[PDB]
Amino acid sequence: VFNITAELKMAARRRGEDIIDLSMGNPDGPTPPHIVEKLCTVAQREDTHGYSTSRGIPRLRRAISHWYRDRYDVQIDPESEAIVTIGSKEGLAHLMLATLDHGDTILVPNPSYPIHIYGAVIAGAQVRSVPLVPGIDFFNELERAIRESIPKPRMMILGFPSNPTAQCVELDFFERVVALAKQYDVMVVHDLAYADIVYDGWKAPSIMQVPGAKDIAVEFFTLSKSYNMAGWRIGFMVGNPELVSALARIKSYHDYGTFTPLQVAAIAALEGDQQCVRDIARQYQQRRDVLVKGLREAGWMVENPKASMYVWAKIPEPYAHLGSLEFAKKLLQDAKVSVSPGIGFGDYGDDHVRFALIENRDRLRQAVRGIKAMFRADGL
Amino acid sequence: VFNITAELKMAARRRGEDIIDLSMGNPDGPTPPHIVEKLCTVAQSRGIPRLRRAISHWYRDRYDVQIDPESEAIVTIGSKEGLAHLMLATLDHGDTILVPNPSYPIHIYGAVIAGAQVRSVPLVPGIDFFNELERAIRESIPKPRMMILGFPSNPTAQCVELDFFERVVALAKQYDVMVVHDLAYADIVYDGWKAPSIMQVPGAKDIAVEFFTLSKSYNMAGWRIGFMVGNPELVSALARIKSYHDYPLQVAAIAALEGDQQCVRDIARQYQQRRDVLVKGLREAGWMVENPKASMYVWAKIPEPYAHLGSLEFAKKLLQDAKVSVSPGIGFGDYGDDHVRFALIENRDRLRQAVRGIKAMFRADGL
Amino acid sequence: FNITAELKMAARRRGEDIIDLSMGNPDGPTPPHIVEKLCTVAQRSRGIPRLRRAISHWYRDRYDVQIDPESEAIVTIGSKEGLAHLMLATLDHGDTILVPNPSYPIHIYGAVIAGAQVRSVPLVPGIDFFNELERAIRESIPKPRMMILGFPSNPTAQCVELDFFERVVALAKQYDVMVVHDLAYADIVYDGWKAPSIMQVPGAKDIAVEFFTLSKSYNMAGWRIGFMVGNPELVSALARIKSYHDYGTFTPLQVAAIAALEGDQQCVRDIARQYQQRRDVLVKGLREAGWMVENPKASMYVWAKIPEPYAHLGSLEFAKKLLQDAKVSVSPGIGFGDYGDDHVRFALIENRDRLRQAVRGIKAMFRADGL
Amino acid sequence: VFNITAELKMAARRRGEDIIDLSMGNPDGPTPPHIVEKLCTVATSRGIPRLRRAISHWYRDRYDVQIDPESEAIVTIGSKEGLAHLMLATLDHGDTILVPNPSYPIHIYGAVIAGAQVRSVPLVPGIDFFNELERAIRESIPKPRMMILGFPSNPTAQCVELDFFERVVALAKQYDVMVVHDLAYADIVYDGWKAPSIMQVPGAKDIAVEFFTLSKSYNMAGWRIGFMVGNPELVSALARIKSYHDYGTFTPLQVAAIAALEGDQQCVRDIARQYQQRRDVLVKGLREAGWMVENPKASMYVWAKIPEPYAHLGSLEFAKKLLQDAKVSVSPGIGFGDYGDDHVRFALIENRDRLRQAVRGIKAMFRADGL
Numbered sequence A: 001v002f003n004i005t006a007e008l009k010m011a012a013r014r015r016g017e018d019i020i021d022l023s024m025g026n027p028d029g030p031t032p033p034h035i036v037e038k039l040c041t042v043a044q045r046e047d048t049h050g051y052s053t054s055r056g057i058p059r060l061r062r063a064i065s066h067w068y069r070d071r072y073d074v075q076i077d078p079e080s081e082a083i084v085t086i087g088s089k090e091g092l093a094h095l096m097l098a099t100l101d102h103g104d105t106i107l108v109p110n111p112s113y114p115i116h117i118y119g120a121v122i123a124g125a126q127v128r129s130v131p132l133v134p135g136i137d138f139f140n141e142l143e144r145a146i147r148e149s150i151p152k153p154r155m156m157i158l159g160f161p162s163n164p165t166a167q168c169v170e171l172d173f174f175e176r177v178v179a180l181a182k183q184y185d186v187m188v189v190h191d192l193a194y195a196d197i198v199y200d201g202w203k204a205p206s207i208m209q210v211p212g213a214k215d216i217a218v219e220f221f222t223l224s225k226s227y228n229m230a231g232w233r234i235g236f237m238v239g240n241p242e243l244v245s246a247l248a249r250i251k252s253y254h255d256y257g258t259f260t261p262l263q264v265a266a267i268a269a270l271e272g273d274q275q276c277v278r279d280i281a282r283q284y285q286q287r288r289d290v291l292v293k294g295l296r297e298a299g300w301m302v303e304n305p306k307a308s309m310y311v312w313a314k315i316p317e318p319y320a321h322l323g324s325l326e327f328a329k330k331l332l333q334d335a336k337v338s339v340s341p342g343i344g345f346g347d348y349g350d351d352h353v354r355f356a357l358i359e360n361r362d363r364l365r366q367a368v369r370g371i372k373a374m375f376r377a378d379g380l
Numbered sequence B: 001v002f003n004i005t006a007e008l009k010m011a012a013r014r015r016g017e018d019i020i021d022l023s024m025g026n027p028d029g030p031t032p033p034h035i036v037e038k039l040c041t042v043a044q045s046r047g048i049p050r051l052r053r054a055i056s057h058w059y060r061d062r063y064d065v066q067i068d069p070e071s072e073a074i075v076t077i078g079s080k081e082g083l084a085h086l087m088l089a090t091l092d093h094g095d096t097i098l099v100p101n102p103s104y105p106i107h108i109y110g111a112v113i114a115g116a117q118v119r120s121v122p123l124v125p126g127i128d129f130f131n132e133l134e135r136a137i138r139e140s141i142p143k144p145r146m147m148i149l150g151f152p153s154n155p156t157a158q159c160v161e162l163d164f165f166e167r168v169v170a171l172a173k174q175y176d177v178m179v180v181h182d183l184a185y186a187d188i189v190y191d192g193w194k195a196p197s198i199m200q201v202p203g204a205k206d207i208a209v210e211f212f213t214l215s216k217s218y219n220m221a222g223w224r225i226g227f228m229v230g231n232p233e234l235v236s237a238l239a240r241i242k243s244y245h246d247y248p249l250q251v252a253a254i255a256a257l258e259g260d261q262q263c264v265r266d267i268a269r270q271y272q273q274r275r276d277v278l279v280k281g282l283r284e285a286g287w288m289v290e291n292p293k294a295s296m297y298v299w300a301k302i303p304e305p306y307a308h309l310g311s312l313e314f315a316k317k318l319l320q321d322a323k324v325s326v327s328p329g330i331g332f333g334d335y336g337d338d339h340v341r342f343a344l345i346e347n348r349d350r351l352r353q354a355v356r357g358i359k360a361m362f363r364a365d366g367l
Numbered sequence C: 001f002n003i004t005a006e007l008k009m010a011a012r013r014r015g016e017d018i019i020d021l022s023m024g025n026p027d028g029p030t031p032p033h034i035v036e037k038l039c040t041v042a043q044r045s046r047g048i049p050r051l052r053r054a055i056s057h058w059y060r061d062r063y064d065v066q067i068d069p070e071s072e073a074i075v076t077i078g079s080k081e082g083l084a085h086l087m088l089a090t091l092d093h094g095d096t097i098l099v100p101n102p103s104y105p106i107h108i109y110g111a112v113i114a115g116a117q118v119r120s121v122p123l124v125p126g127i128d129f130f131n132e133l134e135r136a137i138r139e140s141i142p143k144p145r146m147m148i149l150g151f152p153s154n155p156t157a158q159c160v161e162l163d164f165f166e167r168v169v170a171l172a173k174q175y176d177v178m179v180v181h182d183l184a185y186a187d188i189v190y191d192g193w194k195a196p197s198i199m200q201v202p203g204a205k206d207i208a209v210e211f212f213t214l215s216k217s218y219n220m221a222g223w224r225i226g227f228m229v230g231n232p233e234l235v236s237a238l239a240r241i242k243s244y245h246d247y248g249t250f251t252p253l254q255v256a257a258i259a260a261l262e263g264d265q266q267c268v269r270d271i272a273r274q275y276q277q278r279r280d281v282l283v284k285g286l287r288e289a290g291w292m293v294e295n296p297k298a299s300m301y302v303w304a305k306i307p308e309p310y311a312h313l314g315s316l317e318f319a320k321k322l323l324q325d326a327k328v329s330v331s332p333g334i335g336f337g338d339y340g341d342d343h344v345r346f347a348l349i350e351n352r353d354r355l356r357q358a359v360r361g362i363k364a365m366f367r368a369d370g371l
Numbered sequence D: 001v002f003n004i005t006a007e008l009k010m011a012a013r014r015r016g017e018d019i020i021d022l023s024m025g026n027p028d029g030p031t032p033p034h035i036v037e038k039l040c041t042v043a044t045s046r047g048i049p050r051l052r053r054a055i056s057h058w059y060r061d062r063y064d065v066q067i068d069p070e071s072e073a074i075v076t077i078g079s080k081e082g083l084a085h086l087m088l089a090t091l092d093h094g095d096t097i098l099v100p101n102p103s104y105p106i107h108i109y110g111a112v113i114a115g116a117q118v119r120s121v122p123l124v125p126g127i128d129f130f131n132e133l134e135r136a137i138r139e140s141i142p143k144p145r146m147m148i149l150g151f152p153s154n155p156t157a158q159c160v161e162l163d164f165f166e167r168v169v170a171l172a173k174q175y176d177v178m179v180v181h182d183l184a185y186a187d188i189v190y191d192g193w194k195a196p197s198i199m200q201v202p203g204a205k206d207i208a209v210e211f212f213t214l215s216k217s218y219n220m221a222g223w224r225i226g227f228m229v230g231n232p233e234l235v236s237a238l239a240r241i242k243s244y245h246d247y248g249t250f251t252p253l254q255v256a257a258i259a260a261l262e263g264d265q266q267c268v269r270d271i272a273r274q275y276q277q278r279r280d281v282l283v284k285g286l287r288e289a290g291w292m293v294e295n296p297k298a299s300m301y302v303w304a305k306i307p308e309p310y311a312h313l314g315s316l317e318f319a320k321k322l323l324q325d326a327k328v329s330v331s332p333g334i335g336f337g338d339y340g341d342d343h344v345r346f347a348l349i350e351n352r353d354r355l356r357q358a359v360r361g362i363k364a365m366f367r368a369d370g371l
């Protein structure tokens, strides 16, 4: 369905229209200079080679261990419990191949990030979606989902802060999941891509802070959003040492490691001064504030996200009959603002659209003006 | 879990106990002698045309339904097998199907063949089955390929009216989800209650198939002869799968269908009287079990004071203390853990003996 | 086989008297003492414990072989269905099995049901079979899970000695490839011969199972009753699979199976010797006509090399010629694998007079043609 | 099984032995500055149009082949991964693919990971490869869906001419078996020899695709960039699976890739020359010691027949001896398929002084063995 709104947008650009594109999570801004300089400097050294070791260069797995200790007081063995990925999409897709085949089911929330589905369907797995929405007991539905699939699902894939809803959970959420996943012996994957994209002084919890999460869980983190990595993919997975090893084995038949100069560049991102991450977080918080306040002054009472790069907006009553896909087309044609239709994230999302905070503030104000002129011209 | 209770039962008889076996669902009764005689005489790809003509007449005479015997009917060696081959023809390996909970698992073998995965759908008092069915469809990605239903129902004895089927069929067509219906207990009905066929619903043949076995109606337990009727493209799919075998009870089985039918009535009558003894008996003992309106089963809710134990442990209690073997409800799914299933497959004297074994158990536990 | 069965029926609807030696179904009646028990018990998960005892005694008295009735034998609803279930128990979807070419396709149903791929191993005169079998084992990755064999063979009638099996078993142990052997035609033996069991090879049960269908030895076509013996862990696999499938094998057939296997074997001796006399009439008639066929020593088939003037036709089109011109239906050899395409199969399923009418139509065809 | 050889090597280093590592074929030389520069200054699923145009020009200039950049070309993330995805897009459980033996093990793996089974076809002096190749097609049911080839070859260094490819293509077209060709070593050619593309065969595109990686030609090892050309449907298939995975655009790397293809091509010739010089030193050195290895005509590899006195040890054991006695790590031929158990592979990935050091170790080992 995102193909549909990608086409309409591109048609609008080719018509010459000035479209505020708030429909993708591609960071707009530049990569921090220390990171780019390392990459370039290391690539230019005659002794450098692109290929590296199966699990990542030891110094980088060390940096990831340190990142866990410092942020979460969590122990990750760099030798056995950490592995460098070529971004989390690669990482996940490969964990699924290693772990899933025809005859297996994974559980995903609805609405959620569709990448987690594709990988599993590509690996041969079936997907069972679990409602994650206001006024439904998630833990009842998750436990139903486990009990009422035969055979039980091998795995459940969660991601907080959430894409697309911006939902944040505290540590007692993770305790429940973990105790539940151990009870039925279902593996937990957790996607921590938005851990640094956090507003109002809040911190994102890792699942690896629960005692014995390592016995049942793995956790993916990507550098894309925290460090504005554009046209570069790198991250890691940690936790259960057998799952880390199964990802290592599958990867050795696919790649020669992550591009070495990018791995060295990741060391410079993860180590040392993290002001560039706080600035990126801050830049999103203020874009959030212009968007949310502006939509509200126009009479669209959108909810204020506590994290992620997304405002997950409930379709106003007077347009609710249209559906998300139809509404998002209207926003594009009438307001000259590209959004993602909520239905693209699962059927429980059809009453919403998602905005990504990827244009600057003036542009955002221009998006708000376009939406407000639409309301006015529709008689609202 | 049935293997668990089939082995404790055989361990009890290993020990010289007089166990009243009400746990299998297999007729004790004699096959009508005219059918057995025709087997003796005969001994001296879609199935025999004659046998396929017989099902067509059957479908017309019972249900006013048109079945073309050239294309819309196929003989099977039983519904487990036929369901296996359909699944094989219709699923990609690993695909999903919908099974009610609680229900008799006629899919297990198909699941082994197709690598099928089951989404269990609650079919229980208190919950809206259609909302749950549509939910399970929607929430499985990709969509399930089929839903397997059976009325009258094993193990619940739940019967349905035509309007259920017109409602399943309308929903099936809405999501292009194939409907398989097992009419195995169509003749075992009580009190002028009657069993509709999903094929009475107009346009059913665009989305549904129906299986019937001879084993319950005619006491042909293990003769394994049945048939499938429905969509002609799915009949043809089965015929392909059967043709890979490249290959007498079929012939004998003609007598069952096109012969005199009083024996089918007499069989249902036998089960009805048996039902009356156990139900009456259990109730004298204060076990206020529901009277079934159809099928060979009494679906008994576990008395509150035995509720804590769960179906498995109550069944162990029953086997140890009352010398009666029952099917624990959880063998039919988690939504059956508060029941047991009795099969009316012993004689009435023996049903009485079981009633007295249950009573005493209750006398000794202070009820 | 469908093609030739359609042309045959076409010819009959046109009023032609076709001598059908194409189908392969026993025409004789089931011995009374067998039928008797089917009737009587009908009126009144591993197989009946008594029937598995009758299998155990069968192997002890015919092959001096110990088969433990409680763990090493199991009753089947025929060998085709029995093989499918074994395959479901031991194959992962998409795995490969080895099969001789040419051979009768008893594997096909299992292959489709278990999702198995097939690798054929040429089994023909002048090709080292063991070379090809091991080569087929080594050139497949992952290793094939099983090889399927059947001696006396359908369609070639080939017979092997006990040494052929001790090499198979020894090879199968080397690579850890399961052996399945089909003893179907063991009792259909001629001229004083006794057919050997793979289970006579010491430690055969470590790597192999053996299947017997009652159909051929006892005129029990359509009865769908046989057994498997061998490895206890493979038998237990089959017992599990079968428990999901059916409540149990039709007891009257099981008790009929006991009459067949226990006691007086005079009726199997008589069936054999009948096939022998039919063999002699067809083999002799065909040679008299300058069709120099091989003579089988077991089984019901005369595996007949296509005469050279008709070799360019292939087995399909030549068999069509037999049907059209001689009024005889044979099974083309290609239906058994491409390495059969210079043969046709004859089944000894008509009476001697009918077999002579065939030989006669065939003689006239050579005479009408150039030969 | 190259894990055993990599573990022994690491053990030796851990003991301070100076090991000349000629096992894993990892290019050791630097990427040309002009390529690497484009990484610094720049920092759909079919690829940047300009890159696909460069691909097109490369096929037109080198081979006189027309490849529509719109429909017949796709940027991969390198051949290893790109092939792995083509396999996931085209293969599942129930398929079999065909691979030579000995051959490049990474093809086998992508296929297996996708769930295909693999049938290997001997490609060795003394055996007729096309006869065995057609047998492998005909004797597997279902018939294999694809065959994967690569010349010049890893590990054997075999080079073929266009005549070879036009017989593959015709055989492929006769049986409708797709053909995958790996052109990774197109530029690593010696002594004026030249490697053809399967696309020079007219109608190749109806049945065939070709992979080329920038890794060897341009010392871009681990850069995760290449492309695939040929059949538009297999190209579209690769395109769709890429969309769903969304592993990334990697414009900087595509941009660098453009610099490789459009830049001065002398660096490629320099790279080939360097390997030709290292080959001259290893071949001449071994021969002076009395090990008369075949001179490769292309590829980073010397494919050395185990000398007769050591033949009996087999390749893994002879490789181990080479590491212990000569202080040289080689890859044992059996890791490439059973038909390679009589060779070892050297990779020309160490400089000439080091190659001299290897040779001296190997000579000292022949001398201590009295051979």
Ligand SMILES: Cc1ncc(COP(=O)(O)O)c(C=O)c1O
Pocket (backbone or CB within 6 Å): A025, A086, A087, A088, A089, A090, A113, A159, A163, A191, A193, A222, A223, A224, A233, A234, A235, D247
């Ligand atoms: C939940 C989540 N995980 C991962 C990613 C990005 O993954 P990668 O590291 O491959 O860039 C995103 C970007 O959309 C995301 O939203």
Ligand SMILES: *Cc1c(COP(=O)(O)O)cnc(C)c1O
Pocket (backbone or CB within 6 Å): A051, A256, D023, D024, D025, D026, D027, D154, D215, D216, D221, D222
């Ligand atoms: C091409 C390549 C290889 C190939 O050598 P093998 O030892 O045969 O695997 C290895 N590593 C890299 C980085 C390569 O590019």
